[model samples]
Structures are given as structure tokens and as C-alpha cells.
Target chain A: SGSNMSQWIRFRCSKIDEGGDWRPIVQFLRYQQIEFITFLGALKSFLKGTPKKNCLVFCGPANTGKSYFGMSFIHFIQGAVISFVNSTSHFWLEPLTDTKVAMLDDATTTCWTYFDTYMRNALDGNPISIDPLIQLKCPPILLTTNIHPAKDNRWPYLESRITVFEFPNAFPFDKNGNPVYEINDKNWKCFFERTWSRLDL
Target chain B: HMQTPKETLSERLSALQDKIIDHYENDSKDIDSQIQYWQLIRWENAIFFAAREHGIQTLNHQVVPAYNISKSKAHKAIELQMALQGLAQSAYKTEDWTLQDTCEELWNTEPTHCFKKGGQTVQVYFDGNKDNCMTYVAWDSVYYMTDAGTWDKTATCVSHRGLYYVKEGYNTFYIEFKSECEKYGNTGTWEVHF
Candidate 1:
């Protein structure tokens, strides 16, 4: 009954046009009406209407900039969000309710203690009240973590729910023949600017 | 009556033994099933030994023209001897056991080893894990089966049957093990030794 189209959006953080420009890439994606398939297959849903309304946890080895990119993605979608403390241990719990998109940068740190309980409640689609704070109607949760929790015995709770999107270190070249990171690597402003151009933003 | 000469008896015994051995070696029926071969051989040996012990020289029997020994009895006797030899060798050479103990143990263990009665070569097929059937040529296809380990051979007809690789070289090859009806058998990991 709906358009079930999916797309992948890969971007080079550099502004160099040594070969093919990013315009054709954007035009092709726009023409196809395909959304990106990354992180719980969320980028597509966020661009489209039918969001999966479940937790999307990003997990991989350390120093991969998982938290940095994850937070950036959330901020890009939902602008200028407020920070409020709730009874729940997770820092992202409150924002997930009102905000369309929520980010949990390095969630594995504090979330590991009550991860089983939180994951169980989230998957069951059960609502729990956090006073004067967030009330989630099973909103889409985006989490970033360094280590993927073990599934067999250590963290059986997340076995069913967790969808991992791997982020390897900024390689010399992405699959699309573009530099992984720009010349001014730490300059996120320049990186985003170039990325926005790729997206025709 | 002309005295039966010693040479005549010796000649007859030798011929009898030869008749039995030839039947075992050449008869298709005797080579087919190793299990049946072992059984028949044991019975044949028992009868032959009994006759020798009782000093029975001549017995009423249907004798084949090719050899004075009855074909039926000759096959049984030869099959028994060969099967016994194979089994005795296996038990003695078994990795965990001493050769002396293995040989002695074969006599103690009835039905320790069995062979198919008929001697027809069993077709063991090999299939590579990857797609495509492989064929190689080697010496005889007959593999020695032992209690310790079984030697398996896979052969695919090469592009040239007469010319084979003489020097050490590397070539990618695939092989698979198949039973009757293309069913899988135990797989073998092949590494070239020579």
C-alpha cells in the first residue's frame, strides 16, 4: 500500500572534485526517491514517514567516532533540543519522548547497568512514566557505543532489538573513491558543509 | 599296482594350492562382498586343514578341468587365506597396538574384521566442496582399508591422460566425497606429498 523504497547515502567529507561531482549522485537518489539504509535502517525512515519506533543502537570497537557521528545525525534531524534529568539512568531518556529523534552518545557506559531492563521494556512496547520528564510512546531511540554487548549470555536482552551499523576508522578512501575525512579532519564545520553540498542541502 | 610316486603327490598338492589361489585372485563373485569373502574363506580353510590332518588324499568332488581342485572349494580356500592375511595385518599394525599383539589378537577376536563377500571394486566418488567434478589418475584405484585409517582415492580424467605433472607446482583443485546415489561420504583433505 506504500512505497517501500530504500537507498544508501555515502558521502566524502572532502570538497575536492577531482573526478565526478556529487550533483549526479544527489539527482540519482532524488529521482529514485530512495532513502539511506543505515543505523536500524533509520535514515530512510526518518527521511520518509514510517519510522520503526524502536531503539537503534550503534556498536563497534573504540576510536571509531561512533558517538560523535551518532549525535551529529540526531542533531541534524532535530534542532536545538533541551537537556533534562529524569529518574531513569539514561541521559537520552527524556529527549526521546518529545523530540522526533533522540541520540545516546556512548550509551553503553551507563546503560549497561539497566540495559536488560530498559531493552525488555522498550521491545515489549510498554510505557513507563518518568515524572515531569519524558513519556515515550515507543519513540525511535538512537544509541552509540564502542563495544557491542555479547548476546549469548552477557546481554541476552539486546539480542533481538540491537541493529548495529559498523563505522570503521576514517579510511584513506571510501568505497566511492572519495577521501574518508577532509584535509582539516577535526573541522566538523567544514566536513558538514561539504556533506551538505553532496546532499544538495 | 604302480607305487604312487612322491613327486606325483607333491605335484598334486602344489596344483591344488595354485587352483585355490587363482580362483580367489580372478573370480569376480569371490571379490565382490568382503564380508562374505571372509566368512567363506574361514570355512574353506577349516575343511582343507581337516583333510590334511586326517591324511585324506583323494575325495569325491566335481573337479574343474583347468585345475584338479573343485572350483567351489578352491575359491573358498583362497578367499579365506587372503581375507585372513588382510585382517591379521590390520590388527597387528593398528596404531595403539604392537604388531605382535595385533596378530595374536586377530585369532582371539571372532568377527573382529569383516570383508564384503564379492570382490568387485567398490566405487568411491569424491566431489569438491565448490561446484565442478574433479578427476585425477593415479596408480590402481584399490585402497587399503584398515582399522586405524582408510585410504581414499579421487580420480578425475585430466586433459591429457598420458602426460602428468612431473615437477613440484601448485594448482587449485576441488574434491568431494560421495557414496551411492551421490550421497556424501567422509570428506578428505588432500595435500600433495610428492
Candidate 2:
């Protein structure tokens, strides 16, 4: 019975994706090479449930594919995304109960006051005791923000708990300063489909 | 033909007054609803005269009163309506008055300092000094203050009522104040629960 325990764990783990192998997805990310590998490594660590101090924050200017990256990661992991505007600190305790990889999209600077503290507690993996009798374990958080967290001194605790990835321009622009490649839903879908076909999984 | 500034404002005021009377007479279903509607009209007229008398071009006040009227609060609402009309008249007569000026005018002259706008009772008070100001909007039962400018000591949260309301899950309010040196220069905005 002891000898078969390792095999049982392996079998259960493999069943996570019955039809698709995650190796091809990892390899596809590695081939992209520039910054995708860094994101891939962070995502892998988060999926493994390893104790980590920082939450993944993708920061950049608008239309830089920051949200796209976060959405893709959520889609890959089969997690839920919750959107908020000017959310208070206490607003987080309810939605975060069952989510494993929670994505906070389009986080504005106005909400940073509460979000700063919320992110710190979430990244530290501390048990948030709400009613003194009930406790909840913090889940791994992924968020996109236009405001650069590092530039502001207000979030000192968040400084150490955030892994920031800068998103540059997603496409080159013409002389008129308009983007040459329009990044619409159709284009993104085609790109993802083509990339997935190239992968071994 | 182009109308003079005074003529245009007079016509606008007259038209608004007619609309207010018509709503009070023909449209409102009962005394309580009529009283609430009259309160909204009085507040609107107050802003119109205040903006016109001060040469403020950008003063656009919108008031959405509470539709759910209670007979229990009808008497209080009626009294408050008359008080607001009196306050509006006082506001129209004064020149170079800040929100603080209007608030003080309402408090000193009127029996009560609290009034209802959009179904919320708002209380106005000065902070440590006269220039600094704060207010309590009964909608959320919360208080907010102005920036408290240091240079001219001019920035203040002057008035309440028409400017305070909730939108998109935010308790929003506006502060009409005198900019750097001008008595009635610009307006500032604040969102409660932020």
C-alpha cells in the first residue's frame, strides 16, 4: 500500500488536464522567450501552491495588453475573475472565499488605499479572521493596474509583495501614431489558437 | 434677436418657476409628494439665482428627489420646503457669497440648519476655522471636508443639497467654492466611501 501511494498521487495530478498536457503550454511560453518565460515561471509557482510572498502585478499604460495577459492566465488556470471600481477594503473578504487564482482587472488608483492593504494580507497568505470564529486562507491574486506601484511610496508593504511585469506597446504604430495592428477579440483569438496548435499539448 | 444676459436669466427663472408651480399644482399626486417636489424646485431655483447673480457660467444643478414619500415625514418636509425657499431668497440677495456664506445665512436666519435634498437630510458645519468646512449627508450618514487651501485660505465646502447624490455605487458630492482669490471661482468634487 505504501509503494502504490506515489503512483496514486501522480495519477490524480495527471487527471488535472485529461486531454491536454501542460508541457506544450509551458514550451509555447518558453519559445516566446522575451518576458513570457518569466510570467510562465511565476504562474507555475502559483499553481503549485508553494508559499510565496508576492502577488503578480502587471503594470503598464493603457492598451498595452496587460489585461490580456491576466485574462489568458486566468483562462489557462480555469480561475474566476472579479472586477471592481473603488472597492472598499472589506469588499474583498466575501468574493475571495472559494477562488484559488483570483484576477482583479482594471484596478484604478482611487482604490489603491484599500487595495494596498488587501493585497498585502492576501500575498502573505495570512488567515483573515472575520467573525473571530470564521477564518479564510488568502488566495493567490493577479491584477492589472495602469498606475505603477513602485513609483508610489504609499504602498510600502505592497512593494515587497508585488512581482511587477512591465507591458510595452503591443504593436508598432504608423507615422500618424495609430497602431498598425488592431488588437481586437478576433485577432487575439486567432493568435491564441495558432499558438496553441504549434504546441505539443 | 439676442437677449440680454439679465433678460435670458429672467426668462429662464420665470420658466423654471412656472414648471415648479405646475408640478406642485397639477402633477404631484398628494401633499407629501408635492412638498418633496416643491423642495426640489426651491433648491433648483436657489442654484439658478445664485449662479446667475454671481456670473458663474458653469453652474448646472440637477436635483432628483426621493420618489418614495412617507406621510409621517410630510409635515417636517413641508416645513423644510418653506425654509429652503426662504434660504434661496436670502442666497439670491447676497453677492460674493461662498458656500460658507450661504450656509451661515441659512443657519443664522432660519430656525434649523438641516434640510432635505433628494430625500437626505444634510447638516452643515464649519471645521476648526471659518475657512475650513465639512458636511454630513444623511444618505450614507458620512462626513467629508474640503482641501483647506493654505495660501488664500479660500477653499471651503460651501453648500449642500443639490450637489450630493449617489452614482455608480459611489456617494458623490460637489463643493462650490471661491478659487484662489475669486469669491466664486470654481467647484470641487468628493466621493464618499472612497
lDDT of 2 by residue, B1-194 (tens): 89766555556655664454344223322334333554644554454545545564432121211222223233433554554344344322232322222222232321233322222434333322332233333332212222331111111122433333332345454432223212211234322221
Model 2 root mean square deviation, Cα atoms: 25.7
Model 1 TM-score on a 0 to 1 scale: 0.32
lDDT of 2 at B97: 25
lDDT of 1 by residue, B35-66 (tens): 34444434544444445445654322211122
Q: Write candidate 2's Cα lDDT for A1-201 as tens digits.
A: 122322423333343433332332322222222223245345544543434333677777666656765676565444567666454444545665676567888667755556676554565666665444676766677878887776868776566556776664442344688643343333333333333322211
